[PDB]
Design a protein around this ligand. Sequence first.
Ligand SMILES: NC(=O)c1ccc[n+]([C@@H]2O[C@H](COP(=O)([O-])OP(=O)(O)OC[C@H]3O[C@@H](n4cnc5c(N)ncnc54)[C@H](O)[C@@H]3O)[C@@H](O)[C@H]2O)c1
Ligand SMILES: O=C(O)[C@]1(O)C[C@H](CP(=O)(O)O)[C@@H](O)[C@H](O)C1
Ligand SMILES: [Zn+2]
Length: 336
Amino acid sequence: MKLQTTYPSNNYPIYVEHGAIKYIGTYLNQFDQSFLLIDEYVNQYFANKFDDINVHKVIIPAGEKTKTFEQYQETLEYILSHHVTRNTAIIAVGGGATGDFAGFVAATLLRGVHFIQVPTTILAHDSSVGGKVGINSKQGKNLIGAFYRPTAVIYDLDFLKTLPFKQILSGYAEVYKHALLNGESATQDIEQHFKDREILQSLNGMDKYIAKGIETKLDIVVADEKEQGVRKFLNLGHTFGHAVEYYHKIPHGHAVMVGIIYQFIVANALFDSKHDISHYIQYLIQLGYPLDMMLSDKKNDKQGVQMVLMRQFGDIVVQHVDQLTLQHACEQLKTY
Ligand SMILES: NC(=O)c1ccc[n+]([C@@H]2O[C@H](COP(=O)([O-])OP(=O)(O)OC[C@H]3O[C@@H](n4cnc5c(N)ncnc54)[C@H](O)[C@@H]3O)[C@@H](O)[C@H]2O)c1
Ligand SMILES: O=C(O)[C@]1(O)C[C@H](CP(=O)(O)O)[C@@H](O)[C@H](O)C1
Ligand SMILES: [Zn+2]
């Protein structure tokens, strides 16, 4: 299984399969040099699997810790003291935090070097695609960054077999977000597969759902690349997610999910949609999600918050929302 971009020119591949880590050599030795940027923890996890392969490993901080200015500068400089060249490659081995970061590096190093994505998490089935590199600020989630099409995406599904539930739940939220953006057909289909923590935690049939969630996006991104129209949809529930996250430091997905319900709550308070909140709540409980726990966003336009609201499957929209509505929802949600 392989997917590829559809843009007019400068298109990259997305090898999605078990053992795709093999596809990596086929490029590597066609570069002057190559820097391996890898998660501190992830490096532990698979340090050996890479020995099997003009290559300098660069171990970076674990997760979100790596996405800071401080860390961007330090790295670059290091990578610079190697009299590098435009034909050099940056290889992101890890979660979206590793890619988002490394990529930014690869996007700026000498105005643009080669970028290779070796996503290792479930959530990375979204982060590895689109080329939305960038880092964090003291003002929020990724305010500094860029769009930089990766040279290619190597998604070796074997990486996943070692993900704590905490990270499985995190990532799935995206696989699920994508299902949601495919109308009912995919939503209630996926719901009927991963209907409980047991089945989920087992990773059984995740191959199927990830592959689609990606393709789903693959179409949106290949279309509205610079997020001018539809790419704005992918920000489903992040309006509230991105917030609750950077403000509760829970795993990305956890906040997304939450925000994803919030969105619905607000859909009802606006278009009086027939959203069965209680249904989505039991879904998160049955799935095993925790369940005990905004003015600066990217879709925002000077006037107030802009949310990606679903009025019904196959009918997503974006628009302002008075803090008024944002209350009853973030209060109706408090009744849980
Ligand atoms: N389009 C985009 O650029 C985009 C899309 C989605 C989300 N994101 C970004 O993605 C990040 C969230 O993704 P994430 O969950 O992958 O982040 P992450 O890098 O923090 O990974 C989660 C944790 O799991 C560890 N880990 C990674 N691979 C593992 C594996 N295979 N087995 C076990 N442990 C592993 C990491 O060390 C980390 O502690 C955020 O920084 C978010 O802003 C960006
Ligand atoms: O266009 C995308 O790929 C996203 O909207 C990009 C966002 C990141 P942003 O809102 O910081 O651009 C990501 O969290 C979301 O899951 C998908
Ligand atoms: Zn996200």
